[PDB]
Amino acid sequence: ENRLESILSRFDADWTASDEARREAKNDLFFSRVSQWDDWLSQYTTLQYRGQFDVVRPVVRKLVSEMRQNPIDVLYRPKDGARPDAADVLMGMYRTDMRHNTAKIAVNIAVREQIEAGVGAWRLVTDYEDQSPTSNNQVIRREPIHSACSHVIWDSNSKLMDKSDARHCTVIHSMSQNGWEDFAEKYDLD
Amino acid sequence: YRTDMRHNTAKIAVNIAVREQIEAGVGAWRLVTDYEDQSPTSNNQVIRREPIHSACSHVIWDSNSKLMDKSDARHCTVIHSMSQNGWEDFAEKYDLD
Amino acid sequence: ENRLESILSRFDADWTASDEARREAKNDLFFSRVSQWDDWLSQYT
Amino acid sequence: QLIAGEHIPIVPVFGEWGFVEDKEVYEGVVRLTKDGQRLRNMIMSFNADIVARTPKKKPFFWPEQIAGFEHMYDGNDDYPYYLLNRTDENSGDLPTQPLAYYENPEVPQANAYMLEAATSAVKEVATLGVDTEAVNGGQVAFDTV
Amino acid sequence: QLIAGEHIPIVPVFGEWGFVEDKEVYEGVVRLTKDGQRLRNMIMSFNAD
Amino acid sequence: PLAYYENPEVPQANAYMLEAATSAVKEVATLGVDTEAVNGGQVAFDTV
Amino acid sequence: IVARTPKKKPFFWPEQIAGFEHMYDGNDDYPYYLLNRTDENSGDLPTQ
Amino acid sequence: NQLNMRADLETYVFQDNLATAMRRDGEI
């Protein structure tokens, strides 16, 4: 149909995209449950004893402990035709605004989550630094995303892993009062 | 860095933090500044690493800090528990009633 | 809202920030319990 | 509001991933384990009540065969032995020295077998094919994704 | 009262850390053990009596 | 006296449960502690 | 089988316990366990 | 322990200068 109401086209591609962050995200955020919390579900304060043999963490911790000591970064080789010293420039800075703790963290969280639930993610953003900028009074930075299975949903019908062929990727934020305050300050809102 | 990080205070602040990090999962220490006239790191000044006991409950910084090093936070309110004489020696430092 | 009472903006970012030093700090300081002290809880003598 | 480059600034990491009903499916390792893991927990808890809320081994008397000296049976190491009323007006008391004790707690074979199996089945699926040390970390399939 | 450099002078060390309900979660090793550890203690004590 | 007070025994339950209780503990009592001198089970801790 | 199945408990007659079903509730209060010997209208047969 | 070996110098060094003392090493 033809209904160019903007928030209607947009809320009707998220609402169309969360009927899937349903069937799946339902299971996903709940592994994040049997783990980072009690393996008992749906009853609180009951009267009989409830205890924790809790076997699974040890293998979790294992895997992480393995992925942590196998960092794996990017490379940027030149190309078949490119002159040898084509990347260095590039990498020179990738390695720059990728040193900070934020970059290291965004990943580990993502991986931690990838292991337990199967997913994970982080984002990239830009703003200005006047003192010690990567370049152009600008820098780039890798931010973290908690609970990505349920915070990121991009059903545009993305038929592959890197959601490189998608067009939505709607994300959501949960934040305190003061945060919303500091946020509406940044992006100029009421 | 190696200079005002030799003293026992620096070594300790960490071990406590780690000890705590292991058992509870958290831990922390702070950095502070004041004047030394004899043997200053520099500028009649030095820097020092102080310890923080029970950091999970003594340090709270929910500004909605979305990462581990609370580098993206804006609060980090800390609290101190201390004896009478300490509060006395404290209100002496920071000039209080 | 607009209420530039200083100790009110500050105590209302700690009070806003301890509702979490609740749910979690409750468990945390208590591991510091099962360890650096007895593993029995809530009954004395 | 136009943001920088020419991609969505969100890279996603997955564990095991694919499509089925043409619906998206993925999962971490944990999924397969939840099933037996609760069993573990459960049988655990059950057996916990068994040791707790269950009577301990003590003799079955009649008030009449102990009567007069229920004092030795209280835990006293005071006395050389244990006495029992032989007689009773209105019959020839039949005190067959307490051949009856409350049987001990035992943890049913079922809970015993099931726990063991429950935890076995778990570590079964608790390996992505973890290979020898220093090699083919069971997680190559994870590093690549 | 203006203190020195341009950060909060408090570095925090964590064990296992992440977010869930969008609530902060972390823990030391001890957490997982408390559950059976009391059992130990308990059965212990019981058998002692 | 064909009758003696039976001895204390420690129920099978308390016997089984203790053993299991302590087993389940050391289970989760490893961050994946690797061979000596290597991948200390705490690499995941050193880095954080 | 482990879930929906009765647990191990004694079979009594209401008459051999009657008067003191209180010791059998889980109490470690008492030195022992008592049973009604008698019963008007017979010679109660309480085979513990 | 060795941690306390150190606070045994922070206490010694800072003690000799008061009492034992008696040195000074100039160049030319």
CA A64, CA F43: separation in Å to the nearest integer? Answer: 9
Instruction: For residue F3, give both structure tokens.
Output: 């009758």
Cβ partners under 8 Å of residue A32, min gap 6:
A113, A116, A117, A147, A149, E20
Tell me if E26 and B26 make a contact (CB, 8 A cut-off): yes
Instruction: For residue D8, give both structure tokens.
Output: 């969505």
Phi, psi for H25 (deg, rounded to 5) = -130, 90
CA C24, CA E21: separation in Å to the nearest integer? Answer: 12
Please report residues of B whose CB lies closer than 8 A to that of A179.
Answer: 63-64
> At CA D59, angle to CA D56 and CA D65, rounded to 5?
150
**Helix and strand counts by DSSP (H, E) for chain A:** 8, 4
Tell me if F21 and E13 make a contact (CB, 8 A cut-off): no
CA A60, CA D32: separation in Å to the nearest integer? Answer: 13
- Contact, F41 vs A69, CB < 8 A? no
- Contact, G29 vs G42, CB < 8 A? no
3-state helix, strand, coil in chain E (%, to 5): 40, 20, 40
Please give, rounded to a whole number of angstroms, the shortest distance from the CA of B7 to a CA of chain H: 9
CA B22, CA A62: separation in Å to the nearest integer? Answer: 16
Tell me if D104 and F2 make a contact (CB, 8 A cut-off): no
User: Which 20-39 residues of chain G touch chain D by CB within 8 A?
Assistant: 24, 26-28, 30-37
CA A129, CA A93: separation in Å to the nearest integer? Answer: 14
Interface of F with B (CB under 8 A): 45, 48
H helices of chain D, where?
34-52, 63-66, 109-124, 140-144
Identify the closest residue of chain E to D53 by CA–CA distance: E46
Residue E13 DSSP code: -
Instruction: For residue B7, give both structure tokens.
Output: 């003293």
Which amino acid, residue D61? F
CA B61, CA B70: separation in Å to the nearest integer? Answer: 8
Q: Which of A106, A100, A104 lies closest to A72, judged by CA? A: A104
Pairing of strands D24-27, A152-153: unpaired
How large is the greatest C-alpha to C-alpha distance in chain G, in angstroms? Answer: 42
CA G44, CA D95: separation in Å to the nearest integer? Answer: 14
- Contact, G13 vs G35, CB < 8 A? no
CA A22, CA A31: separation in Å to the nearest integer? Answer: 15
Chain E interface disruption, residue of A30, A39, A54, A115, most E CBs within 10 A: A54
CB pairs < 8 Å spanning B and E: 71
CA F16, CA D111: separation in Å to the nearest integer? Answer: 11
- Contact, E41 vs D52, CB < 8 A? no
- Contact, A76 vs A94, CB < 8 A? yes
Please report residues of H whose CB lies closer than 8 A to that of B8.
Answer: 3, 6-7, 10
Radius of gyration (Cα) for chain D, nearest Å?
A: 32
- Contact, B48 vs B14, CB < 8 A? no
- Contact, C26 vs B14, CB < 8 A? no
- Contact, E28 vs B22, CB < 8 A? yes
Beta bridge partners of F8: none
User: Which 114-153 residues of chain A touch chain B by CB within 8 A?
Assistant: 143-144, 146
Instruction: For residue E13, give both structure tokens.
Output: 């060390």
CA A109, CA E29: separation in Å to the nearest integer? Answer: 18
Cβ partners under 8 Å of residue D120, min gap 6:
none
- Contact, D32 vs A116, CB < 8 A? no
Experimental method: X-ray
CA C23 from chain centre, in angstroms, equals 8
CA C33, CA E37: separation in Å to the nearest integer? Answer: 13
At C25, which helix (H) or strand (E)? Answer: helix C25-34
- Contact, D137 vs A115, CB < 8 A? no
CA D66, CA D84: separation in Å to the nearest integer? Answer: 6
Residue D61 DSSP code: E
- Contact, E42 vs C39, CB < 8 A? no
CA B59, CA F19: separation in Å to the nearest integer? Answer: 39
Radius of gyration (Cα) for chain H, nearest Å?
A: 13
CA E4, CA D57: separation in Å to the nearest integer? Answer: 71
State the number of CA atoms in the 13 A half-sphere of B95 facing the CB. Answer: 1
H helices of C1-45, where?
6-14, 20-23, 25-34
Please give, rounded to a whole number of angstroms, the shortest distance from the CA of D14 to a CA of chain A: 4
Tell me if E25 and A37 make a contact (CB, 8 A cut-off): yes
Question: Is D51 within 8 Å of chain E by CB?
Answer: yes
CA A161, CA D128: separation in Å to the nearest integer? Answer: 20
At A152, which helix (H) or strand (E)? Answer: strand A152-153
Please give, rounded to a whole number of angstroms, the shortest distance from the CA of G39 to a CA of chain D: 13
Residue length, chain G? Answer: 48
Which amino acid, residue A94? Y
Please give, rounded to a whole number of angstroms, the shortest distance from the CA of E6 to a CA of chain D: 28
Question: Do chain H and A touch: 3 or more Cβ pairs under 8 angstroms?
Answer: no
Q: Which of B32, B26, B69 lies closest to B47, judged by CA? A: B32
CA B27, CA B18: separation in Å to the nearest integer? Answer: 6
H helices of chain A, where?
6-14, 20-23, 25-34, 57-68, 87-94, 101-116, 148-151, 177-186
Identify the closest residue of chain B to A176 by CA–CA distance: B64
H helices of chain B, where?
8-23, 55-58, 84-93
- Provide the 3-class DSSP secondary structure of residue D10: strand
Total Cβ atoms within 10 A of residue C9: 12
**Helix and strand counts by DSSP (H, E) for chain H:** 2, 0
Instruction: For residue B47, give both structure tokens.
Output: 């820097």
Q: Edge to edge, what strands does the sheet with A121-128 contain?
A: A138-144, A121-128, D10-12
Tell me if D138 and A56 make a contact (CB, 8 A cut-off): no
Which amino acid, residue H14? F
Which amino acid, residue D111? N
CA D143 from chain centre, in angstroms, equals 36
Instruction: For residue A80, give both structure tokens.
Output: 């078949």
3-state helix, strand, coil in chain H (%, to 5): 30, 0, 70
Tell me if E25 and A36 make a contact (CB, 8 A cut-off): yes
Please report residues of E whose CB lies closer than 8 A to that of D51.
Answer: 42-43, 46
